[PDB]
Assembly symmetry: D3
């Protein structure tokens, strides 16, 4: 009933977990939820509803990049009444103060996109998450015994960067890692008065080149999954 | 080998078709290819290698928006030696010179993205297709009896535009339609010394708000797929 | 030991409270601090060192605007070894979600300045405070029974705005009020790896035109001075 | 009848050739046209109407730089009803793919000018020729056994560049040569719904530093002159 | 020899008058100079040397627009050792403070070009004339009983503007008239350590549309010619 | 009468000297004026009225940075009917040609601020003083035998520059020094139709690293002060 979601109205709980990869959403729905039901699949972009420790929770893939993430979040909020958008994914660390398996909470999302200057008077929009959600994330991680890393991320239009020489200046200004959506998620949620947070686990270090093995990857993504479901409980 | 395609090095023919929607890809594999093999499925983004009248050809989804398109197109060219990239898809008409069913050949792709300024000295990159390819498309459509409409497209980061007041100016400067990736397709192929072209089928006119019925939407999309397969013959 | 500060090295405590107006700094010192000494007075810009419940506190004025603020923040951090910088002041509200007497915590500072494009690759810097400082403010407010309003502010180069028509768009994107230094404070503290936060008291509401009287302005600000002081004990 | 052109209305044929230098224009008329007459001479910028193998063709000089080109082209289309504009001139080649005596067809014109941002919403306008004209140039060229070199051109505001370090990157993005008008020609033609094409003779590299001798300039340019007159016949 | 001037080295005197129209340069040579000879004529862009009441002086055309002006004045300074460049021409008035026949001395030249951002770190270059020259023009005007209007001009890349709605804001900021080269003359003279000045005669009013009779233009331009020659005396 | 000035009606004379430092302002009052009265002191920013050689003159502090100077200058013109604003401040030299406590007259003020693009259509505002005021400076300085350098200054948002590599380019374009308010003064005075001029004494040399002290920045500048007083006589 939107050009990118074929769910029925009401099929989404007001809390939604987000990933770029629709197959990760699938993995989460099978392994971590009871009574999960696939509710959308336009363009193979999967969404699910189901229960986690008795509470209703929703999952939704959103593709890669600001433009794509912006499409699905816009529809999720405007048509399907999602109110809290918690978003999890991987990132390449650029700071010396984070390493493999760390979970980063993005209190800001810088960007090389033009999307926010187009949204916001051609000025600098400081794209930021909802504070109460970050507080629930901080509190839950302490309780779970996770050493939550906290700082800005840089949301890039480029997976294959042309500005790799600038990563140290980004790290100087407290950017812990690079991904590709958070500035879009945060700006859209600000645009539509909804609540958003982004969480990112370190799977590679772009400076010193250490990398997780493909099943070390899955163990640390699981650690992040559990943190996310726990803070929505 | 790449973080977004799980094909083996050697599975792609040098010619490749592209669509945002990977479900479009499999529909073309089934209904039009012989010996259609699936060769990649990372993040549900399906790819296919098959046969059309005895000649090899590939298919590949690339998701929505410039950032996603660039990732897949960069990896196709750099890792899988793809040489000719032909993008087909839908687009929103903005010009009185076009209506529903029309197929548009994009001789240039303007954009509201900052990606080309980042790539290109913060100047104006004129994002354009390979000429030889555009000639094939013109001759094939003449041989096939298709009244090819030719002009610019505007590639936007926004599906839900904040600048609809501007569509009239775009149309005046010979922009026939809007979509969300061609400027990225063209600049990547320009960057990596490969050949590229973008074809667009008109499904919705954004000015008159005419829309095709899905009985014609499959009808017109087939016309375009055939034109594209023909010019790769 | 800098062109703009004539204190002795060591005169500053590592926690420093900031106001634009040096006479506000003079007030706080005389009314709320023990054994307050004046440590700097270049350009009539007063800084102080004293105690509050036995614990050392410093105070410093920074003038109006990002450029003036940046000058003093840089010198405090670099020459005088200050580690936490807490800014408190007034602000014009622009959001319906806040009214007179409200204290705002700025979890992000947007801007019409070019300073952060100059510092940060001509990209978008998301200027954010230190998280631990923000959590300390949330907990101290809760303990004092203060109803903290959390969101962005907008830091302008213009007190006399040429863009008043834009305040509705800023409010929509969760900018709760307008002032003139937070973006430079946050970016300088980001640049030099120090901890910073901004707190804003609503005395005027730029949209609904409500306003506190001179005696209610004094009363309201005092409520913010005590939260700040309580935050540092 | 316009401030920059002296001709009576109807003096111009609907197909017009353009050079930057009005002495090229006078040269073309006396060696290749029959019954040729000077129709305009404001600011010494010569224009001619004449006959080539029976068919009436016009010639018009336009000066150097986008702003100059834009003045003349604007008056040709709006006042004197020229419909097709074929620009022929020299350029400095920057790509290894082209060498001396080569004729470049500019299928896109990049630029360091701000004019197209001012024309086009401060976005990227991809400035492009009319496809049909470019195909006629390709078909004519091959009929005359001229191997056309095809790609993008960079239209600069600077003859004495301050960014010579950037030429390698421009060449990477398929810019074959540098000149100073094409992006202004294409944009204006797009604005005013006219058909336009730029052709460029490789007199001088800029990288190799190879410059052909006095004898050859005349010969290579005449070659482009015949190409131009033939696709207009 | 330079690409755009075929004068002998040593042909120019160190003081040069400039006009965009080479036929204006010819007119001044024949009417006001003693023993004037033509020294250059590339691209029909005439230059002259001669004497004014016994003292040597040169005249040079430079076409229209910043790019064209910049080519010629660069070559005048670096190759032909011209030291003082005084540009005379017409403009369109935009301010109610000036009328027809008024002579404007441009103490600053704003622009919509990108050329000064390209020259100067993408900041704002304040393009200004040489102070001593503007003093000499002030004094000579007084001597001649000419009432000199003094202010900024706006140097536009557009003769046919797309921002006529902005003319009033320009006039508010002390822009007396619009023309097309002064920002380039000024920035090039600044780049190359020469002395430049621009004087403008009001032929037309862009707001109230008043105009001089082409009989009253010839007379008013003459006054400006005499001012320029005399201040070189 | 404004939120930043609390002077009585008519407390300001129509001529007003400006400093960034209100203590340099106070030092001029107490040393040079008869009947010196302090007419404002909001935020410790001192303004004074008094008499010099019989004629009544005012003095006003404006803080550091374009934003602060705009606030005070805007209020001086709109509420206190100041007509002539003469800034006499400090600046850092960026040439060996220029020594400490040299006095510069800024015929133009370039900037890295975005304030003038915000004010002026996102084009290049050429920020210049009132000519007659600068002629007064020139003739006054000469009658007094006070030496005066004349050129542009660069008005930065940054006292601690992040672009020290650019100083030679700035000096190349006739920028004699760096300061932080002249572009703000000049723009505001252009906006509101008032007469402004900026003089500045070299208080630092940015190549060789000499710097005066806070007290020397009040007391080493008598010649500039006397120059200002005399030109207002
Ligand atoms: O170095 C400087 N930069 C800016 N303003 C100044 N005022 C004195 N020195 C300086």
């Amino acid at each position: 009933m939107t050009p990118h979601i074929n769910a029925k109205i009401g099929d989404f709980y007001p809390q939604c977990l987000l990933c770029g990869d629709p197959l990760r959403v699938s993995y989460i729905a099978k392994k971590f939820l009871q009574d999960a039901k696939e509710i959308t699949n336009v363009r193979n972009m999967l969404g699910f509803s189901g229960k986690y420790k008795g509470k209703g929770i929703s999952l939704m893939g959103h593709g890669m990049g600001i433009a794509s993430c912006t499409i699905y979040v816009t529809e999720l909020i405007k048509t399907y009444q999602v109110k809290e958008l918690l978003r999890i994914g991987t990132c390449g660390a650029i700071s010396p103060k984070v390493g493999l398996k760390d979970i980063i909470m993005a209190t800001g999302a810088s960007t090389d996109s033009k999307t926010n200057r187009v949204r916001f008077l051609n000025h600098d929009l400081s794209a930021t998450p909802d504070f109460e959600l970050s507080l629930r994330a901080y509190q839950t991680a302490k309780r779970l015994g996770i050493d939550l890393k906290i700082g800005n991320v840089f949301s890039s239009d480029f997976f294959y960067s042309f500005e790799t020489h600038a990563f140290d200046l980004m790290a100087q200004y407290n950017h812990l890692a690079i991904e590709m959506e958070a500035a879009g998620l945060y700006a859209t949620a600000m645009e539509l008065n909804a609540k958003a947070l982004c969480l990112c686990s370190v799977s590679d270090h772009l400076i010193t080149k250490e990398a997780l093995s493909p099943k070390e990857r899955i163990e640390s993504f699981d650690n992040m999954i559990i943190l996310a479901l726990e803070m929505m409980s």
